[PDB]
Ligand binder design. Structure first.
Ligand SMILES: CC(C)(COP(=O)(O)OP(=O)(O)OC[C@H]1O[C@@H](n2cnc3c(N)ncnc32)[C@H](O)[C@@H]1OP(=O)(O)O)[C@@H](O)C(=O)NCCC(=O)NCCS
Ligand SMILES: CC(C)(COP(=O)(O)OP(=O)(O)OC[C@H]1O[C@@H](n2cnc3c(N)ncnc32)[C@H](O)[C@@H]1OP(=O)(O)O)[C@@H](O)C(=O)NCCC(=O)NCCS
Lengths: 422, 247
């Protein structure tokens, strides 16, 4: 209890908030679907887990979309200043994106700082992700310089981490706009409903995004169009192709569509046709080539049978339950689990062709062994495989060194032949 | 890239926004059903098509309702000024309604202007529609005088054309309130659902309406009651009898 002077970083925060009173501000609010973000993020994080990479977040995706949108609507990057006592518009050279990072200090008081990613308009998603993680990493270790806090042209904040629906924030001097990301969750009138019922109806999740801008240099129509562009990108085919290409994931991204009625051909029939398509033609998209190489003059076969759109199914069917007739040793399953099992059996490092065989007992024998999977080997077995690989490569290198000109027809590139024959 | 002086209409917009910093403002938000508006608008536009007339819009209907509401709650028309260095309340003679029209220019830069419909409290729907269309028509042809930009007492804006859900706008000096109309659409948690399923459940469409007011002369309860009246009129038997009779 009592009075105490403000000192340190807090005195700086107080002074800036007082200066900011001389900015006239207005706000726009828009709500967007969030289903496709959840789906496609999960697909990317599965790829990274197998390759012992990292993890992407929602802020990464919204950040990248925001940059593309500012490029499409350049007025959102401008600011206002009085120079020589005349009003002036300032048009910067680059898009520098500020991130609002909440970091605790040694004392035990939280403080918010805004750090910058510079020259963002000449980056792809791979580059963007690296720069983002660089800033965050150094902030925790306490190794940010004074140059990292200068030159911000547009800012991003995430109050939805705590669970706030939306906010109306303050704009700091030298900028034109600040963008805020709210909670990604079901609405509160459905927070007591059952999963079964929500799946039946087709209810999705929301996200609310805000824009707070200086009204001396940005008009309302521009702010509205900015948010409309962001809404289109996050549900667009071409946008998710970029992200998938950059992160090296082999599957087609999940697409955006409306839910369809269970009329005509039943949906159980359609799930059984999908199982048959993967068993028959899944080898066409399997990861069996060590190089990322497509030969220029060879025809590419049609493989439209392997996407859920051709069988009249949609993202809205992934958590519904279906009759599968003994597949996976189960009578009933969800479409998510069906796709997972099919992809693990027919689309990884082994591709198989066996459905053309006429005898039923042969087909069943292969099908059973191919869907059980490869059993995990012991440590002794693993060391034996390494000894044989070493022998192969070592022998080749020895001959190369001692007899240079002589013709030997090497096996370099194909050393796995020795453990296969063994 | 670089610095460039603000000149022309843009300099005027900048100066007014700076002056407006000396108004204490507060906001109210309310959401309303929108099914009956869609239905009854379609019925009116079918009649006009057979008689080779025009077309009415949602802004026409909300505009007329807004005028009736201001009549029911007169305090929403007042403003504040200091005269002889004393605080003063200003009570106007008429309700002059300003429309925010986004018009592109010859250069290729959009600008927003606010034009006025005058003496609105002595009009029926037929008269109202004519006056509205007059202002809009002359704005496109570039034939607005200086008298059309003066005497505004209350304003109307439509950010829902682009698809914004709602906004918190700025209030300009000399007025008491500004009203904003948001998007008329299903909520975003139903934007992937089927038509069949929505019909079965009985899900309708929304509209969000806002009110931004000067807190030195208007209280919160008055602003709330204003929006409650507008909500009742747009779902009222007697209101739609007037519009149908006039058309
Ligand atoms: C590890 C890192 C890659 C992000 O990991 P992350 O788990 O996706 O992010 P967080 O730890 O902040 O979020 C924890 C959880 O909250 C969720 N979450 C975060 N923001 C959310 C939002 N607006 N709505 C709903 N859920 C949200 C995340 O999805 C995650 O849930 P999960 O268990 O499904 O993964 C790293 O960038 C990080 O830790 N960043 C935090 C600091 C930061 O990004 N600050 C600037 C934000 S502008
Ligand atoms: C032609 C005129 C009679 C209006 O015609 P209109 O088609 O109803 O209006 P717009 O052209 O602006 O709107 C185009 C479409 O957007 C829709 N729309 C407009 N505002 C909307 C809103 N807030 N929410 C949802 N849809 C909206 C209209 O219903 C129309 O859709 P439709 O294909 O079903 O007719 C004429 O008054 C006009 O063009 N006005 C535009 C300028 C103006 O009114 N400015 C002042 C607004 S305060």
């Amino acid at each position: 209890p009592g009075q105490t002077p403000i000192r340190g970083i807090f005195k700086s925060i107080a002074k800036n908030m007082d200066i900011s009173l001389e900015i006239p501000t207005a706000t726009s609010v828009r709500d967007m679907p969030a289903r496709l973000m959840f789906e496609n993020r999960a697909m990317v994080n599965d790829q990274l887990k197998r390759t012992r990479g990292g993890k992407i977040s929602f802020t990464h995706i919204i950040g990248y979309a925001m940059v593309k949108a500012v490029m499409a609507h350049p007025d959102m990057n401008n600011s206002y200043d009085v120079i020589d006592g005349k009003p002036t518009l300032i048009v910067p050279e680059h898009i520098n994106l500020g991130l609002a990072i909440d970091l605790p200090q040694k004392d035990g008081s939280r403080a918010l700082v805004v750090a910058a990613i510079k020259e963002t308009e000449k980056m792809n998603f791979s580059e963007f992700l690296a720069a983002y993680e660089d800033i965050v990493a150094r902030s925790r270790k306490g190794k940010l310089t004074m140059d990292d806090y200068q030159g911000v042209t547009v800012s991003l904040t995430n109050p939805g981490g705590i669970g706030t629906r939306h906010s109306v924030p303050r704009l700091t001097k030298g900028q034109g706009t600040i963008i805020g990301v709210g909670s990604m969750d079901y609405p509160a009138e459905f927070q007591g409903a059952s999963e079964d019922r929500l799946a039946e109806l087709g209810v999705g999740k929301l996200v609310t995004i805000t824009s707070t801008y200086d009204h001396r240099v940005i008009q309302g129509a521009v702010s509205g169009e900015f948010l409309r562009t962001m809404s289109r990108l996050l549900t667009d085919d071409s946008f998710w192709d970029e992200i998938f290409d950059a992160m090296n994931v082999p599957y087609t991204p999940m697409r955006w569509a409306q839910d369809v009625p269970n009329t005509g051909v039943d949906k159980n029939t359609r799930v059984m046709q999908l199982i048959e398509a993967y068993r028959s033609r899944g080898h066409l998209i399997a990861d069996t080539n060590p190089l990322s190489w497509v030969q220029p003059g060879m025809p590419v076969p049609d493989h439209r049978d392997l996407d859920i759109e051709t069988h009249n199914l949609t993202i809205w069917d992934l958590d519904r339950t279906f009759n599968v007739g003994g597949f996976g040793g189960k009578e009933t399953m969800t479409l998510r689990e069906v796709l997972s099992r099919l992809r693990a059996a027919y689309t990884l490092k082994v591709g198989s062709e066996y459905t053309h065989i006429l005898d039923r007992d042969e087909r069943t024998w292969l099908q059973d062994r191919l869907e059980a999977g490869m059993p995990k080997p012991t440590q002794a077995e693993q060391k034996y495989i390494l000894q044989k690989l070493n022998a192969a490569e070592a022998f080749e290198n020895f001959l190369q060194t001692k007899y240079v000109g002589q013709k030997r027809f090497s096996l370099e590139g194909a050393e796995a032949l020795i453990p296969l024959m063994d």
